[PDB]
Amino acid sequence: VKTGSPTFVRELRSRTFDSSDEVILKPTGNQLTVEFLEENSFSVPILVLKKDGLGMTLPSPSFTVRDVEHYVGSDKEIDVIDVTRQADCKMKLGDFVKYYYSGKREKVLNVISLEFSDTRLSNLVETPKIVRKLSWVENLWPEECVFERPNVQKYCLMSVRDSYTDFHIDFGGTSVWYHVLKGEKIFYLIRPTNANLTLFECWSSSSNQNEMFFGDQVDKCYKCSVKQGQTLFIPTGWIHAVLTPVDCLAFGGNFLHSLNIEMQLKAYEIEKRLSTADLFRFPNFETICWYVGKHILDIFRGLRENRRHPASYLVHGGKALNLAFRAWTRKEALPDHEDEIPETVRTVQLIKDLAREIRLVED
Amino acid sequence: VKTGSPTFVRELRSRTFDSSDEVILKPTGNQLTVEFLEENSFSVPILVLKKDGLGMTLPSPSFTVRDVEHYVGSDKEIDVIDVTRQADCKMKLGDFVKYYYSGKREKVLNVISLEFSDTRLSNLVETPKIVRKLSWVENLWPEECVFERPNVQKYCLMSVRDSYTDFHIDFGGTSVWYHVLKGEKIFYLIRPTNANLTLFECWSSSSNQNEMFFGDQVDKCYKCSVKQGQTLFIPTGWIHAVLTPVDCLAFGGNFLHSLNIEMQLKAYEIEKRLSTADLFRFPNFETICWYVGKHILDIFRGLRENRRHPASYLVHGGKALNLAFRAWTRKEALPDHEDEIPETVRTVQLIKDLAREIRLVED
Numbered sequence: 215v216k217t218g219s220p221t222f223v224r225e226l227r228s229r230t231f232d233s234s235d236e237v238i239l240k241p242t243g244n245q246l247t248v249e250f251l252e253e254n255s256f257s258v259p260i261l262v263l264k265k266d267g268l269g270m271t272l273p274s275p276s277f278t279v280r281d282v283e284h285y286v287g288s289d290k291e292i293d294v295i296d297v298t299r300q301a302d303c304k305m306k307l308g309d310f311v312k313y314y315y316s317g318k319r320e321k322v323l324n325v326i327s328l329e330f331s332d333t334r335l336s337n338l339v340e341t342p343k344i345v346r347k348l349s350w351v352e353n354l355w356p357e358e359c360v361f362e363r364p365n366v367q368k369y370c371l372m373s374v375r376d377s378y379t380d381f382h383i384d385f386g387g388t389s390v391w392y393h394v395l396k397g398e399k400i401f402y403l404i405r406p407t408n409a410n411l412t413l414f415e416c417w418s419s420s421s422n423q424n425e426m427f428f429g430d431q432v433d434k435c436y437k438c439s440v441k442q443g444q445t446l447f448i449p450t451g452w453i454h455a456v457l458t459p460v461d462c463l464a465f466g467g468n469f470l471h472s473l474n475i476e477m478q479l480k481a482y483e484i485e486k487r488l489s490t491a492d493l494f495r496f497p498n499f500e501t502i503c504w505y506v507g508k509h510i511l512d513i514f515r516g517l518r519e520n521r522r523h524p525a526s527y528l529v530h531g532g533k534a535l536n537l538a539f540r541a542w543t544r545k546e547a548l549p550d551h552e553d554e555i556p557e558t559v560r561t562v563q564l565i566k567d568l569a570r571e572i573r574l575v576e577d
Numbered sequence: 578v579k580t581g582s583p584t585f586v587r588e589l590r591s592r593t594f595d596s597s598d599e600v601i602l603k604p605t606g607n608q609l610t611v612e613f614l615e616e617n618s619f620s621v622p623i624l625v626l627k628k629d630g631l632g633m634t635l636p637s638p639s640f641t642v643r644d645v646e647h648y649v650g651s652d653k654e655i656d657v658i659d660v661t662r663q664a665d666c667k668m669k670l671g672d673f674v675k676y677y678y679s680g681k682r683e684k685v686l687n688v689i690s691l692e693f694s695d696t697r698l699s700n701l702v703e704t705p706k707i708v709r710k711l712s713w714v715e716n717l718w719p720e721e722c723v724f725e726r727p728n729v730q731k732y733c734l735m736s737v738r739d740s741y742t743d744f745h746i747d748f749g750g751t752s753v754w755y756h757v758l759k760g761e762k763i764f765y766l767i768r769p770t771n772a773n774l775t776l777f778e779c780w781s782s783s784s785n786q787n788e789m790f791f792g793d794q795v796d797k798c799y800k801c802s803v804k805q806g807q808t809l810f811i812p813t814g815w816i817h818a819v820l821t822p823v824d825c826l827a828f829g830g831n832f833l834h835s836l837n838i839e840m841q842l843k844a845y846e847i848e849k850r851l852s853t854a855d856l857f858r859f860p861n862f863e864t865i866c867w868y869v870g871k872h873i874l875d876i877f878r879g880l881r882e883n884r885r886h887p888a889s890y891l892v893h894g895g896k897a898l899n900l901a902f903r904a905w906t907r908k909e910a911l912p913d914h915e916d917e918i919p920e921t922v923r924t925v926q927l928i929k930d931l932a933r934e935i936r937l938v939e940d
């Protein structure tokens with residue numbers, strides 16, 4: 215049985231898996247704050263039932279694929295996946311709209327990466343406040359920087375019934391939020407334990423990858439239905455597949471943050487190796503790491519100047535970052551990383567100082 | 578208003594707090610496994626509704642205080658707390674039994690630390706299998722060792738209506754399980770974030786500690802009702818108070834484990850400083866740490882010999898342990914720690930080797 219085919223989907227549909235209720239947190243919008251995520255950590259998926267308190271702005275649930283076309287443009291080239299889990303290709307949006315309303319489902323076409331930040335649609339959607347507060351690119355990417363800035367904050371997803379996206383780790387080790395405006399999406403979520411990552415890498419490389427349901431190889435594969443008006447936040451590194459059971463229109467975006475830097479670096483390294491994408495959807499990952507390194511040093515200096523202590527998660531994140539910094543700048547690795555280092559950063563000193571501040575904060 | 582008084586309790590009772598449902602996990606007995614705790618971590622309280630699958634052995638819910646007396650002995654001296662949150666004192670068990678059945682509640686007396694391992698009662702109670710699997714003392718304390726072995730595996734608790742135990746961290750940085758055989762207990766649980774620990778230390782030292790409800794000073798104080806037949810597991814460091822709303826008989830025990838060693842060391846250090854106990858209920862904490870250090874080194878060596886990787890939590894735990902090892906053996910600190918070091922342990926080499934194995938496992 216080939217992954218993505220109609221028989222594969224018919225079978226997937228009848229499966230139950232482990233209940234998402236065993237792992238997800240379900241705060242209200244008002245409860246999902248920075249403090250909440252610092253205290254709770256952001257290590258399991260978070261499903262918010264109603265959008266109230268999330269600080270989003272969205273069109274009404276009456277919004278359509280035709281509307282998307284109007285705000286984005288008929289002529290926009292968009293990446294489409296032919297859900298016979300086969301190929302990628304470009305398509306004019308108007309041609310997709312034609313396919314969509316045609317109702318002809320001989321080919322199952324899925325749109326999941328229409329980034330609309332530079333279109334009129336951008337004015338109609340504001341992302342969750344928590345994301346805007348956490349996001350590295352949003353808060354810590356310097357205006358003066360001359361590197362290409364990642365542009366992955368606003369995606370529109372348009373998925374016909376029976377769309378399937380196979381298990382993957384989100385690009386660049388990012389976390390992601392998804393809001394289903396209409397229809398439903400089913401996420402199959404797997405925790406990125408070292409053990410699961412090993413199985414994932416093995417499966418990603420196996421010759422019969424398209425015939426093996428990854429969720430079967432792990433201890434726990436959690437099924438999470440995200441229905442109309444609901445918002446899902448997936449933490450760094452979580453391995454997941456998505457079945458679209460009914461026609462779905464959704465919005466989402468990808469971000470990096472400081473809550474679990476070790477997991478972020480790890481997810482980044484693994485996905486970089488395993489990805490079959492032709493482009494880095496998150497360019498200059500390392501660059502932003504360097505800037506964050508300096509900012510975290512500043513935080514530690516400040517806390518010490520004021521006789522206060524950092525939260526544990528920051529200490530650990532700063533340490534894992536510093537390990538990465540040393541690895542990227544070793545004599546023999548430097549050639550493959552130098553290009554990503556901002557010309558304003560003195561790496562040897564940043565590393566030395568970070569190490570010092572971190573030593574003055576352990577026990 | 579003084580903490581522990583009848584008016585304090587009457588007021589506590591009407592309070593709602595944050596719902597425990599926001600943080601606790603509620604697996605079944607069969608689900609609560611070592612793998613479960615390694616994957617999920619053990620960082621939030623765990624409430625298991627039915628004992629099935631937990632591997633415990635318990636008398637029936639018809640067991641009584643009179644029965645306890647029969648299996649433990651009328652003449653056993655037991656630590657009693659006079660729940661006018663005032664004093665500790667010793668009592669013969671038979672005198673407590675007299676007080677209990679007397680029904681006279683002019684004094685509110687609470688028994689929470691009757692350790693019965695060396696009595697006939699021990700034969701009637703077997704602790705949860707997960708605890709026996711995790712426990713450091715149970716699995717890693719060497720037979721040949723000549724240090725006094727902590728004896729904290731089996732407690733019987735007998736608590737009249739309106740008993741109150743004020744906010745505290747469990748002794749020796751231990752984790753704890755409690756099974757309510759009859760009645761109910763209400764736990765007020767606070768996460769041991771660095772920020773909360775700072776407030777806790779401040780409150781523990783404040784001159785009007787007995788007039789300040791600690792739960793009010795923190796972002797989140799979670800109320801968790803543990804009813805008949807239910808079992809609660811509290812992770813390392815969690816700050817908690819207990820109100821007994823109705824006559825309660827319960828069993829419990831304290832253990833150390835390897836899932837979050839940093840938090841364990843931290844909780845140990847803080848509780849050691851703040852405790853007003855005359856005795857260490859967990860003697861030789863450092864001793865067992867040293868033995869665990871060597872065992873973890875052995876694990877790392879094994880994994881490397883077999884070209885396999887350790888789980889992330891073990892790497893972090895091994896690191897925090899090694900930091901402690903260095904701190905305990907610095908020239909100027911050594912005098913206050915040398916007594917706890919097993920004469921079979923070569924600390925300088927253990928530390929060097931641990932550090933080496935840990936470096937060979939980061940990235």
Ligand SMILES: OC[C@H]1O[C@@H](O)[C@H](O)[C@@H](O)[C@@H]1O
Nearest residue numbers: 313314315316317318374461
């Ligand atoms: O996708 C199916 C839905 O949208 C269009 O593609 C079809 O024309 C409609 O008949 C249907 O309601």
Ligand SMILES: OC[C@H]1O[C@@H](O)[C@H](O)[C@@H](O)[C@@H]1O
Nearest residue numbers: 381382383418485488489490
């Ligand atoms: O991150 C997930 C990656 O692993 C596998 O799913 C595939 O080989 C890639 O197409 C994918 O990008």
Ligand SMILES: OC[C@H]1O[C@@H](O)[C@H](O)[C@@H](O)[C@@H]1O
Nearest residue numbers: 676677678679680681737824
């Ligand atoms: O604690 C109260 C309960 O046990 C005894 O102390 C009393 O004699 C009983 O009347 C009551 O059922």
Ligand SMILES: OC[C@H]1O[C@@H](O)[C@H](O)[C@@H](O)[C@@H]1O
Nearest residue numbers: 744745746781848851852853
């Ligand atoms: O661990 C908690 C400790 O802090 C405060 O509750 C009190 O000062 C001690 O009696 C207690 O042992």
Ligand code: NI
Nearest residue numbers: 383384390454
């Ligand atoms: Ni995704």
Ligand code: NI
Nearest residue numbers: 746747753817
């Ligand atoms: Ni306790």
